[PDB]
Design a binder for this molecule. Sequence first.
Ligand SMILES: [Fe+2]
Ligand SMILES: [Fe+2]
Lengths: 516, 516
Amino acid sequence: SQVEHPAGGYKKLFETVEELSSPLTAHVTGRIPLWLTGSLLRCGPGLFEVGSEPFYHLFDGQALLHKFDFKEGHVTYHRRFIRTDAYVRAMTEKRIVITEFGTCAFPDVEVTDNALVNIYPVGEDYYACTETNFITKVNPETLETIKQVDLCNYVSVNGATAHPHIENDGTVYNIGNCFGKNFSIAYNIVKIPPLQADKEDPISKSEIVVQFPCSDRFKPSYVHSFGLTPNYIVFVETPVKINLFKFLSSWSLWGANYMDCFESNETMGVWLHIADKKRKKYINNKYRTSPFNLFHHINTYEDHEFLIVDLCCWKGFEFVYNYLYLANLRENWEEVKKNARKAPQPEVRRYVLPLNIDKADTGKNLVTLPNTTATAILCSDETIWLEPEVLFSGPRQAFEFPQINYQKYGGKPYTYAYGLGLNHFVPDRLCKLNVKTKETWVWQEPDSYPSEPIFVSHPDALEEDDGVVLSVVVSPGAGQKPAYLLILNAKDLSEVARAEVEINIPVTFHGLFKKS
Amino acid sequence: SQVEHPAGGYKKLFETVEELSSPLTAHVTGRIPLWLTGSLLRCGPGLFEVGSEPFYHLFDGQALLHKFDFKEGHVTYHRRFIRTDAYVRAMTEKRIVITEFGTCAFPDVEVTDNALVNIYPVGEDYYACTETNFITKVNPETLETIKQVDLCNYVSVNGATAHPHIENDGTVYNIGNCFGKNFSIAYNIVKIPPLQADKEDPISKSEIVVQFPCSDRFKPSYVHSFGLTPNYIVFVETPVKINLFKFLSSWSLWGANYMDCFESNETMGVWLHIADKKRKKYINNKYRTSPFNLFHHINTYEDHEFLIVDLCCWKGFEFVYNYLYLANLRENWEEVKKNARKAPQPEVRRYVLPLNIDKADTGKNLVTLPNTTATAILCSDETIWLEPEVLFSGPRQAFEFPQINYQKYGGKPYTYAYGLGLNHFVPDRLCKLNVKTKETWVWQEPDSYPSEPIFVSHPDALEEDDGVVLSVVVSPGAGQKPAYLLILNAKDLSEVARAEVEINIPVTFHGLFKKS
Ligand SMILES: [Fe+2]
Ligand SMILES: [Fe+2]
């Protein structure tokens, strides 16, 4: 049947913790491999209340930057709150000052800079980020907060995702919502160039490369991530909409938060879009398919005349984020299950977009690749109806937080995807998926709740899966240490080692491994 | 990669054969089980030309009734052409007289009674059938043709499928196209009652039980089969349409055949319909989903408040029957493959229809069953958007001609489905599919091309798969006998025995096993 969680240990993923004064030596069990010399940096919330006022949604709690360090054999753990404008004001004024995603702030309309979602490199720097216009620059070694950076000073966007794409030369691509800034209502592709010899901040030289068109102008789609290949940029327009009439109004005048501005569009489905990366030009192929929520691309790549697009989908048009309020996630296990019964259903899908479309094949399947069941029907009005190839589909068992051997196989033909397993939204197990043969591997322990797994290649790696997978696990229960870092081999998802700590660690969303 | 067929042996599936004067003793290899005492009756074409005039489509060749007999250990094979109006006229006049599906008949507009598709029991009788109004009554023991029966004399339908449902008490349900007969344009459910004590022909007492509504009145959907449970009747309206403006016109005046009257509707998708079987009432739940060709239901059943509907689908709206012309199917193997590259793609899908729809759950997934990833989204306009649970999906590898333990598990909760494997439309292997765990089993030999597998229960059967699977295999190649009957165990799909014959046997579509 299932894997259950009567103990309710997952509630401690959403419990406030305190930062550290300096790094804490972690109790290693097993052999930490000697080639693993770097620093696992991850972001997540760590303050779910300010005094009596609580934060209501998963994505409201004040951002906390975590660092697991690896050197020779040893491991250390450190964490500091990011001194954001939201945090410092909250801490000094002793209440929720800045309005978060799901937690409106009472006075005793400023955009939150609460960078709890991810962290990525720009030039010599590293910015923690949420999905707004404010990215916060942080010190990766000391976890100190350096400066708040406003993208509105450099590019014409209202926000940007927490999932930008980093090319090997350090060039950063990202996608952002634009709500009429510079008279344009669209989705824009920001390009931050790599650091030059003159050492000028890349951000200062950032630019918009290409503009994806909006299906409904007054209701743009929510965008969490996008696809990138050597030649093409994929953007997936979902039916989760942001109602601008509500989003661009005096929020305090009706006690609104960002969530109150969302709507699902029942008739649209999902529109898929393509842009030539190099020519910087939007391609006008009308790719259409049935409705789903989309948050994370697994990977994207060119294969003969086709773009292979692998998505972690949630079936249906209800905003999945409705089921991610902290009230719900801290309920007991039979209620967590009961709540997600009517939720969108998670499925890994491969979508295959044909890049050139012959008029003579109208009414026919264009997807002539030999190794897929994915379909693309050219219609008379020139829409191209796609059906997926399902890669993984389990009942309320979501392969989410996808991760791959990014540096070497990102944007390119690949075979393996590592992921976090959401069991009715409680993170629960770590997964590996072979996208060619649909085969899987699972790591799992009772009352142990892991985070996104990050891949870290062997220096002499020949295979795609020659490396290890790092995960932050929260293991409550008497006797056992409250949390640990988990080092899994990427071949078996077999355990290599554990760095255990004395203190709780809450949920963490995304991160990176910084080599040295 | 693939299983290949350079030899081109499959071409002999579509080669004319000659009937027999009396049964032929078959060379048994292995142990034919002694409980297997009955008669495997199957229909298919066996005359693909009349002199110089060829038949063009797979479904045009003149119907041939095959009989494998089993008694104690021994096996005999017999086959006779069905003396249809199409056949007798063709044979006497020495040319194609009656127009077939894909072969228009030149004069020197009568509906074909060419019953090549299947054969089923009504009362004490057995009727061979195609999909028109003319079913031909045949003798199951001698394979003699008895009489042509016109359903237009008893019920208000234009045709009826070759896949009617037979309940254990012998009651027959079938679905038929109605083109304005009795002022109604619909799909009708015919019910032939079981034989009574007064011994009156059931057909004479047949009646229409319920009328399913038509989406486009001037273009009705092609219907090959339907779903049946103790309480409900499922009908799947596809976008493969029959254009009546073309279908109801003087065909000789522009040399038409049935195929020239087909069209694919690009915007409709697939509409699913439900009827209360017992109250004989159409239920007005607007079940909608993405486009596909549908030919054979696997099975249908009630599970709590939901109908579980398992379909053998072909993704897209192009009429699959376009790729089933004899010119194509008799090409060499690299061309067979090249032809099916742009064809609809085969997939086994589970669809879950909720039978009661709460208005309060608008915009949400209603499918609250614990063991599925299938989805039903109630919309505002009261359409219910469904997404499937994929059960099997391989690239041009079709699980088709589904068959189950019908007598005991038809219309009810079940686990196993046996099928024929279409490898770019060439029938190729026999499959078994566990619908609960997606697990499969395959039987296969090079240059051996089998037919639909029929299940035959052990007299003391406790399990669902306690029995054998019968298949007619055509094995060309020097040294080997040209064809044989195959007896597979239903547990492993392991071989039990072979009844080999000295002569070729062409393709066969559907049939039954007659116990005694
Ligand atoms: Fe994310
Ligand atoms: Fe059929």
